Amino acid sequence: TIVKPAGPPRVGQPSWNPQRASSMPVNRYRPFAEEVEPIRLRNRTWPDRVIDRAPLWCAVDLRDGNQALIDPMSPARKRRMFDLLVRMGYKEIEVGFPSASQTDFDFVREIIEQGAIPDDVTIQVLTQCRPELIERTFQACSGAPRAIVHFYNSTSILQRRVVFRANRAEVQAIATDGARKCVEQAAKYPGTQWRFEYSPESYTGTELEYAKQVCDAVGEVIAPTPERPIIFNLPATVEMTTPNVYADSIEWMSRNLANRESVILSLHPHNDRGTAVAAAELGFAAGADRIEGCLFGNGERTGNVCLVTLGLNLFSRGVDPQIDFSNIDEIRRTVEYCNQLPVHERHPYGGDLVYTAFSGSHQDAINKGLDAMKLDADCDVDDMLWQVPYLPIDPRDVGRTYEAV
């Protein structure tokens, strides 16, 4: 049942606020600062930087997406999703997890063997750090012109204790032993242009100086340069606190990571507090270079950050996302087809209801803007500055329509 909070008000709670204390077991949860650590960052700059360029995108729909699904992608559905990501303009695509999943392996073999990989596309494959998984991962990419090997291990306070029952050095040695193995294997398969990504998985549960240490040591092995750089990918595996703190944490890593101009700083935010998009946009302003997510926000649990929202959030403020969202219906249809999961009615940009006005006063206001833009134009209306109340973008700019209803 649902029962009205009737506990005392807080000390200092103003008289005009009649809310009462719930019976929820708040004692079981700690503020982020105590669960992990306080914010390290001094003199942040991200609040003063407006994004004026698109980042490097990496679409993880085929891995992080696929793995969160109720109904796994068939070989047909993965090809279909690969082709969409390719046609949209994406250049780095995590095509799966071939050491752990025989159908992923099957998938990678297939796109390489059939010459499905375009010349400007770099496939990305996920692996854990154990040696024979790294080997399997290299065998799966055999024949590939280029590939990102993404190796990872969990570094969080919580996971060092209850999963690995291990200390800092040992947890770092896993990553570094993982980098050695990667370097060994890449020399065993010349031809392929091998590139690396390292994630301290559960980063947002990891102490920053410790995240920096592990990354730097991974860096030492790999020996990236400004022409052949490494990716350090900082996931909010669980989105653990507000977006500003994630950004602060990104700004700290970007200032502080060793060999910074040989590093591609990548964001990988999940949406557990509903703020994955904000985490990304602020973390990009904080100095990241790259963002991993999924079309329409598919991905474990609450999902990966939404590639469509981020892309169009740039477009609608005058920045070219470098991805084609001209026909958002088509993107959505393929997405829903691949994942077997609807895009919500109220999803930003693609949801069924997002260019709908039911309010009489909003329909009238939309009519005033649309009628006004005609005047100024009589150049060509479809080319003028968009100026319509309640319609952030011209719906025809993403192939949709405004409906008064």
Stretch that binds a copy of itself, among 48-56, 136-144, 167-175, 177-185 (CB under 8 A): 48-56
Q: Output the known binding site for Mg(2+).
A: 64, 268, 270, 304
Burial of 95 (0-12, 13-18, 19+ CB in 10 A): buried
Which residues fall within 8 angstroms of residue 237, CB to CB, at 6 or more apart?
154, 156, 201, 202, 203, 204, 205, 268, 270
Query: Measured from the CB of residue 392, what is the shortest distance to Mn ion in angstroms?
Result: 14
Of residues 166-185, those binding a copy of itself (CB under 8 A): none
CB of 304 to Mn ion, least distance (A): 6
Q: Which of 126, 231, 245, 263 binds ligand KIV (CB under 6 A)?
A: 126
Work out what residue 209 binds among a copy of itself, Mn ion, ligand KIV, none; the CB cut-off runs from 5 to 8 Å by kind: none
Under 8 Å between Cβ of 246 and 279: yes
Rule CB under 8 A: say whether 115 interacts with a copy of itself: no
Positions 185 through 224 that interact with ligand KIV (CB under 6 A): 199, 201
The SS3 call for residue 278 is: helix
Q: What is the DSSP string of 110-177?
A: HHHHTT-S-TT-EEEEEEESSHHHHHHHHHHTTT-SEEEEEEEEE--HHHHHHTS---HHHHHHHHHH
- Nearer residue to a copy of itself within complex by CB, 61 or 188: 61
235 near ligand KIV, judged by CB under 6 A: yes
Task: Decide if residue 64 touches ligand KIV (CB under 6 A).
Answer: yes
Q: In Å, how far from its chain's centre is CA 256?
A: 22
Could you say whether residue 137 binds ligand KIV (CB under 6 A)?
Answer: no
User: Which residues ranging from 58 to 77 are in contact with Mn ion (CB under 5 A)?
Assistant: 64
**Which of ligand KIV, a copy of itself, Mn ion, none does 45 bind, CB closer than 5 to 8 A by kind?**
none
- Binding ligand KIV by CB under 6 A: which of 137, 176, 237, 271? 237
Tell me whether strands 146-154 and 403-404 are parallel, antiparallel or unpaired. Answer: unpaired
> How far is residue 131 from each of residues 4, 171, 189, 211, 363, measured CA to CA in Å?
55, 15, 16, 22, 62
Token pair recorded at residue 325: 């969202």
Contact between residue 145 and residue 193 where contact means Cβ atoms under 8 Å apart: yes
Residues at the binding site are 63-64, 237, 268, 270, 304
What residues are paired with 242 via a beta bridge? none
User: What mask of x and - would describe binding to ligand KIV in positions 265 to 294, judged by CB under 6 A?
Assistant: ---x-x------------------------
Q: State the residues that interact with ligand KIV by CB under 6 A.
A: 64, 126, 152, 199, 201, 235, 237, 268, 270
